[PDB]
Design a protein around this nucleic acid. Structure first.
Ligand SMILES: [Mg+2]
Ligand SMILES: [Mg+2]
Ligand SMILES: [Mg+2]
Ligand SMILES: [Mg+2]
Ligand SMILES: [Mg+2]
Ligand SMILES: [Mg+2]
Ligand SMILES: [Mg+2]
Ligand SMILES: [Mg+2]
Ligand SMILES: [Mg+2]
Ligand SMILES: [Mg+2]
Ligand SMILES: [Mg+2]
Ligand SMILES: [Mg+2]
Ligand SMILES: [Mg+2]
Ligand SMILES: [Mg+2]
Ligand SMILES: [Mg+2]
Ligand SMILES: [Mg+2]
Ligand SMILES: [Zn+2]
Lengths: 141, 130, 139, 174, 142, 37, 185
RNA sequence: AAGUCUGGGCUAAGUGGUAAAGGAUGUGGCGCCGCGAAGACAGCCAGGAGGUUGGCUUAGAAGCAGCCAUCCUUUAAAGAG
């Protein structure tokens, strides 16, 4: 499951989940995207949970383009320890997802098939989602 | 939209390839015993025009745009219209009145008949066979 | 003393053992079940093998009757490409083949059957039997 | 499409008075009464009833049918009349008419006493057929459904009381 | 097995069988061994078809758990033949006690009592010989 | 009778009624019978 | 092929207020002109879903001054995924860089195994005169195994019609197509 | 204490008067394509047929476990379902 092969800083500051996406608000590889409606931190294992459900569903065939990558370390303190004493230790990765974000993209698959894959995938996810089909707006981008 | 152009360019093309057609209510036999009183309706005649089988008020209103004297002997009930003028009929309509008669409960009772270009009646198209 | 019949099966050529379903209704017959391998594998030692269907009917005093048909389009082509089994995964995997005439000479064998009296229509279905098992047709 | 907008015959001779809220529907078999929405318009005509709705708002449009069929149903019932017959499948199972009342003998340590109500007529022709009949349609449909549920059908055995010609589908025991 | 309660319940109690007849077989023998904690139990050892044996194996160990009274460690139940394993059963131990008197709550005092228990849920495993008194009418009867 | 947050249709013979406040699923195959609860 | 759309001019009007009344902000321009214009949403949606940025939307300006334009870019509301404001390039006669759709004519050999034809570009970039807008442009994908790549340097090219983007540019691939049989590793 | 104020919509849950993923023939409103006097949609009454088990598979898979693939005469039509 995805995570930076290496980095510079072990932990990093939480930040804030404000605005709409800075990039990738348009389908740009396949024919069908899953897009994000609320903002949240999507965790390395969720992306994977969602990828798998689609592969399992296509079973042989299609391509899957996943367009969020989890590079934000997510820290936690040991259970039952007290406040202070330092920063938590890395416990996994999220990627930060903000509304209008195209997360996954399937291709070489029947419309019937795709929307049942991209739909299941969206159940794996902690946020609200919308399935869409590479418009023409997205080609003008 | 979207026929009058589809098949209505076909319903009076192979119903007016002469002037001696009929009308029989063809449906009530199983698709094997219905592809038998039709598939063998090419062995009472030439070509391959048994019953044209298509829509009343798309035949009974194709009987106005071809002006075939308005085939008015029966266009209510099931409609198939024996194209007996895209064949070789005469008393080959006998080779289609013992078939769907001496099999099952009245297998294909008839409707209309235009005798050369004259209305050949109902009570008078049945024994134009025997 | 068992009633009349109207039996509808689908039995192969050669393999004629009393083993079912040459029984579950063919015992409602007292069926002369070995009359198959003789009367049938005599005229049909000319095709070779393959499932030639059979419509048998019993009557009052316990006896039968039938007139069978012809072997699959999946047989007459299997011998004409050196093939026992098809290809496991058709459409992409070709093992043996058949020419525009080798497909025509086959319609010749199964013509008193289907429906079309055409050689242009019949062999299409034979040509349709081509891709169905993965055997290619030479252009 | 559409149902209240549909002619109610009045096959002679069958009265159809109109008072507040309720209609009446009289005939040879008997006399009735039907609750109607005061905001539904009733029309007795040249021997043909029909009723009309103020609007196309979901209430009225639905109030239509019900008020139509419910009045219509009365007609066709003082007219001819309503009835269901029944079907006591199952071996030991029997029923004899007793007095005006219906006796069932069906599997239980006591046979069971069904006394009809006003307007219901109990007809036991043979051992295994019960005929319930009358002018109140619902009452019939109802009463006939009491009788059945005094021993509904099994799922493993054709056995029990059944509607006049209702199917049987069963599942295997073992 | 396959035959009697079935044989009829299948046919609705009509029909019948007689086996006199004793031929022999070249087929497959596969017999699976059942192990409790790894202490292979001889009595529960059973003998079946390679496909059936494969099918039975889940039931044996799983049917096991209700059976084996608890011993102080996580307690292996497994079923297998000739060194590969058809089945798994694990029995919980858990002879927990120790934290039951800490309340102040240094996170670390809580850990100390489980460092001695983690040594104890190990030491006891390596010298553990384990038993089951009857109730085999139950596990591996079925 | 099933009871769920997600009542849905299992086959083409299942109908979705809505009685007395609740969303039911009815079907000639009883196993499919549901009540949103 | 080429379309018509009913643009109206606009002045100081508040963009958000146009938007409110189903109208969509824009502005048309070239070497010479540059004028503040608006167009109806639904009108433009239909036209655009059909036209894209390959063909020629003609503009029914509110004075019989009808103009031949190409959509240079549509700006999208990143959030609720609607278009926000178009640009209209007015065509002259000197050749204009723009985008012509691609026709991947044929089914590859890669599928006919299980593969996936990944169409990298669904259009290309070429300087051509506004006379000759080859509204399709086809490619021989038919001879394609898996692990097969196609580059712009193939590609037929009409009259005529210069590739804008350097020939080494990749436009097509057939790719392995997932597999649950993989995965479990 | 002061409007049972004035007009135009919604809501039938006592929602308003304490929550989420998710579910839903609840009820509304605008904009856009569909099939409809070749009579559409819903019940009905017909038919729903052939080479053909499609080859692989397998112990049996014959439209309908699962891999592949998706053709023609009848014709009013009828999916290698
Ligand atoms: Mg989290
Ligand atoms: Mg944290
Ligand atoms: Mg922390
Ligand atoms: Mg801290
Ligand atoms: Mg979700
Ligand atoms: Mg950019
Ligand atoms: Mg405490
Ligand atoms: Mg569920
Ligand atoms: Mg139902
Ligand atoms: Mg829009
Ligand atoms: Mg007051
Ligand atoms: Mg007032
Ligand atoms: Mg009002
Ligand atoms: Mg309240
Ligand atoms: Mg409340
Ligand atoms: Mg709703
Ligand atoms: Zn159902």
């Amino acid at each position: 499951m995805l995570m930076p092969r290496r980095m510079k800083y072990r932990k990093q500051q939480r930040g804030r989940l404000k605005g709409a996406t800075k990039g990738g608000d348009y389908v740009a590889f396949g024919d069908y995207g899953l897009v994000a409606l609320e903002p949240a931190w999507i965790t390395a294992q969720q992306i994977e949970a969602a990828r798998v459900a689609m592969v399992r569903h296509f079973r042989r065939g299609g391509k899957i383009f996943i367009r969020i990558f989890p590079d934000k370390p997510y820290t936690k303190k040991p259970l039952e320890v007290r406040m202070g004493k330092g920063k938590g230790n890395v416990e996994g990765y999220v990627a930060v997802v903000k509304p209008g974000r195209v997360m996954f993209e399937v291709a070489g698959v029947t419309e019937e098939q795709a929307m049942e894959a991209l739909r299941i995938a969206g159940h794996k996810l902690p946020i609200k989602t919308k399935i869409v089909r590479r418009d023409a707006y997205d080609e003008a981008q | 939209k979207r026929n009058v152009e589809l098949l209505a360019t076909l319903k009076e093309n192979l119903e007016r390839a002469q002037g001696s057609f009929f009308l029989v209510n063809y449906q009530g036999l199983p698709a094997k015993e219905t592809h038998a009183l039709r598939q063998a309706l090419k062995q009472n005649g030439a070509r391959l025009f048994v019953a044209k089988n298509t829509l009343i008020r798309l035949a009974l209103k194709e009987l106005g745009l071809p002006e075939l004297d308005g085939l008015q002997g029966p266009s209510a009930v099931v409609f198939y219209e024996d194209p007996v003028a895209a064949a070789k009929t005469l008393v080959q309509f006998a080779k289609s009145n013992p078939k769907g008669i001496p099999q099952v409960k009245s297998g294909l009772l008839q409707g209309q008949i235009l005798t050369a270009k004259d209305v050949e009646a109902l009570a008078e198209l049945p024994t134009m066979d025997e | 003393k068992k009633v009349v019949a109207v039996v509808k099966l689908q039995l192969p050529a050669g393999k004629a053992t009393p083993a079912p379903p040459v029984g579950p209704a063919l015992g409602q017959h007292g069926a002369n079940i070995m009359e198959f391998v003789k009367a049938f594998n005599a005229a049909t030692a000319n095709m070779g093998d393959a499932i030639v269907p059979v419509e048998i009917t019993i009557y009052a005093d316990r006896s039968f009757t039938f007139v069978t048909k012809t072997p699959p389009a999946s047989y007459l082509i299997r011998k004409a490409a050196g093939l026992e089994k098809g290809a496991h995964k058709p459409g992409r995997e070709k093992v043996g083949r058949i020419t525009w005439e080798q497909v025509l000479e086959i319609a010749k064998q199964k013509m008193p059957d289907l429906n079309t009296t055409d050689l242009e229509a019949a062999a299409r279905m034979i040509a349709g039997s081509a891709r169905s098992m993965g055997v290619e047709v030479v252009g | 499409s559409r149902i209240g907008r549909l002619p109610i015959p009045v096959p002679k001779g069958v009265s159809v008075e109109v008072a507040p809220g309720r209609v009446k529907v009289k005939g040879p078999k008997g006399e009735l009464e039907v609750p109607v929405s005061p905001e539904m318009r009733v029309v007795v005509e040249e021997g043909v009833v029909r009723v009309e709705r103020p609007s196309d708002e979901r209430r009225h449009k639905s109030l239509h049918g019900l008020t139509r069929t419910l009045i219509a149903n009365a007609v066709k019932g003082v007219s001819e009349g309503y009835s269901k017959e029944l079907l006591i499948k199952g071996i030991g199972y029997r029923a004899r008419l007793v007095g005006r009342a219906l006796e069932l003998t069906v599997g239980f340590s006591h046979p069971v006493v069904v006394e009809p109500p006003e307007g219901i007529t109990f007809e036991v022709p043979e051992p295994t057929r019960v005929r319930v009949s009358g002018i109140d349609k619902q009452k019939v449909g109802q009463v006939a459904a009491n009788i059945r549920a005094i021993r509904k059908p099994s799922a493993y055995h054709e056995k029990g009381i059944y509607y006049a010609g209702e199917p049987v589908r069963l599942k295997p025991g073992k | 097995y396959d035959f009697h309660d079935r044989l009829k319940s299948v046919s609705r109690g009509y029909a019948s069988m007689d086996y006199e007849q004793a031929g022999y077989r070249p087929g497959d023998l596969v017999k699976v061994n059942v192990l409790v904690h790894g202490e292979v139990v001889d009595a529960l050892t059973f003998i079946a078809h390679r496909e059936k044996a494969y099918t039975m194996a889940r039931a044996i160990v799983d049917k096991l758990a209700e059976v084996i009274p608890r011993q102080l460690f996580e307690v292996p139940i497994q079923a297998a033949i000739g060194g590969k394993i058809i089945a798994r059963a694990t029995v919980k131990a858990l002879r927990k006690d120790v934290l039951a008197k800490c309340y102040g709550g240094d996170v670390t005092r809580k850990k100390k009592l489980l460092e001695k228990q983690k040594e104890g849920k190990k030491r006891l495993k390596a010298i553990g010989k384990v038993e089951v008194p009857q109730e085999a009418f139950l596990a591996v009867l079925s | 009778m099933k009871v769920r947050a997600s009542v849905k249709r299992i086959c083409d013979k299942c109908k979705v009624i809505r009685r007395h406040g609740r969303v039911y699923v009815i079907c000639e195959n009883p196993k499919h019978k549901q009540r949103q609860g | 092929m080429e379309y018509r759309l009913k643009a109206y001019y606009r002045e100081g009007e508040k963009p958000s207020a146009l938007r409110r009344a189903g109208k969509l902000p824009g502005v048309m321009y070239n070497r010479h002109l540059n004028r503040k214009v608006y167009v109806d949403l639904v009108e433009f949606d239909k036209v655009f879903r059909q036209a894209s940025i390959h063909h020629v939307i003609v503009l029914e300006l509110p004075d019989g001054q009808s103009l031949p334009t190409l959509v240079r870019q549509v700006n999208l509301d990143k959030r609720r995924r609607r278009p926000e404001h178009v640009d209209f390039f007015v065509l002259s006669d000197e050749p204009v860089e723009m985008y012509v759709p691609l026709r991947f004519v044929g089914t590859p050999a890669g599928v006919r195994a299980g593969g996936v034809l990944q169409e990298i570009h669904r259009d290309i970039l070429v300087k051509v005169s506004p006379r000759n807008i080859p509204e399709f442009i086809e490619v021989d994908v038919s001879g394609l195994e898996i692990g097969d790549s196609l580059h712009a340097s193939d590609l037929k090219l009409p009259p005529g019609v210069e590739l804008a983007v350097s020939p080494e540019e990749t436009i097509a691939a057939v790719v392995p197509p997932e597999d649950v049989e993989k995965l479990a590793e």
